[model samples]
Target chain A: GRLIYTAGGYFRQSLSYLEAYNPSDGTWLRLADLQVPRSGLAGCVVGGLLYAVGGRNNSPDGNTDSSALDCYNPMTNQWSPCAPMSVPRNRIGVGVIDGHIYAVGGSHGCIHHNSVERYEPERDEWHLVAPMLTRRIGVGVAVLNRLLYAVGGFDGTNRLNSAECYYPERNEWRMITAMNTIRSGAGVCVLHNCIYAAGGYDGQDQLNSVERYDVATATWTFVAPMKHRRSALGITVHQGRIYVLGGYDGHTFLDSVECYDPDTDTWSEVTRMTSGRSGVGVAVT
Target chain B: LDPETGEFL
Candidate 1:
């Protein structure tokens, strides 16, 4: 029931999976590796299938721009090719609601994108969605009440504090409240009725700031800061706790993992990853 | 960081 899986890394980066931590005793184990090595991708789970989409390989031998979609089935411990995206992207944000997977803004070469698309797995097709109000890469996306929220990201020249949400039922995008701080490469997840945005870089600086958006009220409130400043982090809520994964610090990559408990409004250190990295995607089954 | 750009913290 518990496994720790770490990939070598994108190109040279390692992908990782950690078992749920127990505060009473501290330890971890490894699990299965992804079929391909990549980074700067968006990840989401739909219909029990874990999908990793649109990453880059900085290695000499790797594809410079990858549009490949890789899906993992935990039951078989295997990965298989899925439908690819029409546009190649890196540092994108993905979310799933109903039966669709949405790929939000990301970088294409030197330019950041405002493009957004949704995938219909049953049809093996992707339909273009409304563009985000601002162009950005390394964005954070989450689905709540069938609505998708796109958070802060970099615009090639600068980081942004802009935030927006898409109503799939209406096929329209609208700007929402801006963040307290501008950031890029942050992680996002929905818990209860609130969407949590965490860990990213603000161009010259990295951030551990955590903020939450109340879906019902359409408002944001600050939460406890993270333990470390990180960019390109991955976040998710599991068993009533928030887990923040690998990200880049300005100087080097990090495998340091941290957890936040809203019930107690506290953060605690978890097990470190096998290798240091950033820009990797994450999903929980 | 550009002077015209907002802080990305």
Candidate 2:
């Protein structure tokens, strides 16, 4: 029953394509398209509903970000509009806790953002929350031990190596130890209580380096790097292993997929997608 | 047991 889902992203153009991957059968089945074509979007599953948040819309100019919020029900194969965010943004980091979703730092209209917002599904509303200390875009976020962690991204001028954690009860974010290498557009996920950040760009070049943050010791340690250098990829955890999906490698968009085995600290290639993409949204329910 | 009302403690 290992099911992984990926949604909207840019290939030759902004895509509304949605697909479900079954690791057991090694197959991908196309699902319903997203309500709108988008890229640099954030998605997460909470309470059996797949939520897609703000991202860059498929404007001909390719400069417009969106505040549109859409939710999908896999059981019924339907899409519905929810309350939109107050600020239109793309390249956002999304995390969920206690049945609520939090959208963190991203860029809006070419400006890096530090503002954060929380969505309450029952009310179909979004409310402002404590913002991250650093204004950034292309950051990776994950919920570990009920706390939200925002990892490295581009901070307007430079690719960042810093990391921070948010406390929902306190409504505050505090800086943590920085990653060993600067990266943006990395894929992050929590496996066995450790936050793993995979390949991304380091401002100058695409990277294949990988690192993991240990919550217990408040330190980052390098892990097995991915086979392909990637940026703007998507990640999800299934059966205690981390799966890193399609991304850009400076030269071209990639359809490659790789999986990390924590038990052996190794990465192995998996089935590639039919079409290459970057800035994709991935989630596991 | 309050079986009549289907209630449990």
Candidate 3:
């Protein structure tokens, strides 16, 4: 009963391709293409619709960033445009809570951003929210313990190890314990009350390291590392396990997939994708 | 599929 979805990334070119992975049968099914071709986008599920937000179109040198907001309906096998963002973004972090989509730090081409925006489905509108304290691109974000946590990414000048959490009730961001490793393009998710930060680029090298943050202790502890060093990977939780999909390992684009079992503190390979990709958007509904 | 459709959707 677990279905994992991934779409749009850099693969030969900026792709709009979409696919769904069913762990129940170990099958990857090709699905509808996005309304527009994009890469470095962010995705989240809200009210049963998969929302694909801002990203860049085509390749890096020739293309421009997009402010598009497109939603897909699995039940109807269709894609439609929604309200767009105020500014174009790429490599953003997205999260959902209280039926709204939160888009955090990303960049407009070479410029890093700290702005945050909220999307309301009922009104089909996007509005500015509280900005993050640090400007970043490729940051990882997730909702944990009813608060939104933004993890490591690249600032315009340096790779970051810093982290912060957003309290919705207070509408502000507060600094939190930083990760032990400096990284950008890492994948983050909450599983069983602990926030897991996985493989990413550490400025000089692609890293296979992994770490977990404990809210009660306010600290991060190293966990079992992944088999592959990766950045711009897609991550989602299903049946209490974390599934990490394709990414670039600083050499080649990868189609390899792996999963981490928290209960056993181990990582094992999963069925690979049909094609290699990086900076893809992933979600589960 | 429509011939005009450049790619799958």
Candidate 4:
């Protein structure tokens, strides 16, 4: 409830942002709006600031690509530009570790990438990191216990369910148990030592399925299904509950919001987002 | 070594 920043897809093939707050009771306030418009971006929060990285803007030819990076300060409710990425990538796997942001595997219309890079906000510079095993886009990434985990994405031909873990200490990546379904544009988050992968598309079909992978056991098990089938959604944990932001159903973009509580093992509809969107970026405060 | 030098692709 402390100035949550979330993104969603809109009708004109654009993206939007919303701010959540408490009501008169000082609980939580109404949602606000974002200044810029884009989609297929990833986000990470560090030192009380939110960073939105590489995404694409819809254009006549195709989605106009961008390497633009922006940082949002909740205290001022403003977004300022940051150092751009070396390569323009969209739908890249994104995570934050040790005060640095890592962006992995995204495409720029023609070619998909396996390269990884790190961004230091303090110095406003970018450094290359260890690359992934495969080239993919529309990936979901999360960091748990100082280790970074990247989940399912696309390799141009079809959707992929393979997941990999990267250790910063050794600067290497290792494969892990693949997911049950071959899909991409999924939502992923690491909570309580487990990685939750939910709601993606298998190229032709949209999905509402949810699965969790136990790091200790290295096995994946199915969980309860989401209320809606969506791809390109944003998933993150806030205040002990998993919140799903907007994405796309097969036909149109969505602005619906849902929350899942691991303790209760149940899902509930929280509130509808102000704008419907797909491929929007989401970050927590 | 040039930052943008050859065959890096």
Candidate 5:
């Protein structure tokens, strides 16, 4: 009954692909294409609806940024428009909790953003939240205990190791302890109580490093890293572990998929995707 | 891959 779905990503150019890898069947199935063609888009499922947020297109047509929010219903196999973000973004980070979707910092044109926005489904509108301290893109976002944490990413000039978290009730942002490595385009997701950030570029090299954060202790600890040095990813929590989908590994785009088992602190190379993807949007239902 | 459940072993 668990289906892990991934949407648009860059492969040579931007792709409008949507594929589902169902664990029960252990096979990939192509689904309805996205309404917009984008790479580095962010997605999360809330109330059974998969929402794909901001990203951009860098095809032969021209370079264009998107602010569109598209919602997909699996039962209907259709995608519909939702309230758009106030500004277009690329390589964005998103998190969903308490029936709300939070869009964090990302890049647009040559400018990186420190701005943050939250969408309320009940009101169907987006409002500004306290912006992050760092202007970065490719940030990894994870929700734990109703609090949203934004992890390392690129701040235009350099990759970052700085991290911060937000409080919805207080509408404020606070800096958390930094990761040991400055990771841009890493995959981040929460498993039970802890958050895991895996595989990204550390400015110099493609990283295979993985880190786990304990909010209780305010610390980021190293965990068993992924098998490949994936520098970008479509991350989702599925079947009691974190599944990191295809991304670049410095040399080539990867068709490989890997998952981490927290119980044993080990990693397993599960399966390869249909094709290599450097920036896919992933969600589970 | 598991033949029955289709899950990775």
Candidate 6:
């Protein structure tokens, strides 16, 4: 029906690779490159534009976090600069709420951070917000019932199964039910009233496990697992299914894709990506 | 996306 894009990741893990898939036709379209080749960056849509937020560039002296932000205009197939973040954030989690894009916890090299910030399009700048309860990298974020959720992530020394939520009016975060697995690099998104964390690292190994949280019930339960055990995959709800994209397995960057049908509690291996992209970012238009 | 139906659209 529309286009779903996967942008810069590892292989951009240092190449600025960008490509789009049209689910309606199963076709792929290559697009513009990111100004900063990044891994662990995030993709979010605001007012019809795709925004690629903070992630680290693995090249320049290695492990350097990027504060750079780039905006993609589909009409021109071009990328332009935007206001960078106040701090460099690699493996960041992002959400769009009330016309603002919130960048959640992530790390800068070895330093895990609980810092949170929001972008104001009108002002073309970013401002700090209440930080998460945990210093995290490889975190997954989504909005449910007007509340922003910071799901599973790496908390410095360990991969975490814990989760947290924020109330903007109070400008504070409160702990929520944790995921069943210590899933860092999980692909998370909201569907119906439930939020899901799919296929991540369980601290020790790459995982194929999936789980769901009914925010209404404040409980987390296991769901169907994916066919492959990968980490740092990109995810977005497109059409009626959850599509998980290019992620690394055995440290080998992957190009395979998967689609989850919550309706049937099953997963199907879909088409392959044109390029391998662990730490990729995905968006729909 | 739906939690039950699993389809937001």
**Interface RMSD values, listed in order for every candidate:** 9.7, 25.3, 12.5, 14.5, 14.2, 13.5
lDDT tens readout by residue for model 2, A205-234: 788988988888989999889999888998
The Cα local distance difference test for each model comes to 0.72, 0.85, 0.86, 0.76, 0.85, 0.83
What are the runs in model 1 whose C-alpha is more than 4 Å off?
A1-29, A61-63, B1-9
Chain B TM-score (each prediction, in order): 0.37, 0.47, 0.35, 0.33, 0.72, 0.46
User: Under CAPRI classification, how is model 4 graded?
Assistant: incorrect
Compose the digit string of candidate 1's lDDT tens values, residues A1-285.
322222223314333332233333555535466565566776677777777788666554434666777777767767788888878887788888897889888777776889888889888887788888898787888888888989988877778888998988899899998888787778888877888888777666788888888866777888999888788776776667777877776666677889888888898887786666677677666
Q: DockQ each candidate and list the results.
A: 0.06, 0.01, 0.03, 0.02, 0.02, 0.02
Model 5, position A72: C-alpha lDDT score: 94
What tens-digit string does per-residue lDDT give for candidate 3 at A1-285? Answer: 747889798876688888999988999888999878887888889877888888787654567788888999889878899988988888889988899899898889677999999889999989898899999788999898789999999888888999999998889999999999987889899999999999887877788999999989999999999998888888999889999988888677889889999989999998998898887899997
Worst 10 residues of 4 chain A by lDDT: A21-30
Top DockQ hit: 1
TM-score of chain A in every predicted structure: 0.90, 0.98, 0.98, 0.92, 0.98, 0.96
> Which docking class does model 5 fall in?
incorrect
As for candidate 3, its clashing pairs are: A32-B9
Name the Cα RMSD for model 6: 6.1
lDDT of 1: 0.72
Better of 3 and 4 by lDDT: 3
Q: Which tens-of-lDDT digit does each residue in A14-65 have in candidate 5?
A: 8899889987668998889987788889989889989999888767777688
Each candidate structure's TM-score, on Cα atoms with residue i matched to residue i, is 0.87, 0.95, 0.95, 0.90, 0.95, 0.94
As for DockQ, the candidate ahead, 3 or 4, is: 3
What digit string (tens of lDDT, one per residue) describes model 6 on residues A137-245? 8899988888999998878777798999999889999998888888888899988778988887775678888899986678888898888888888999987799999
Stretches of model 4 off by over 4 angstroms after superposition: A8-10, A16-18, A21-36, A60-62, B1-9
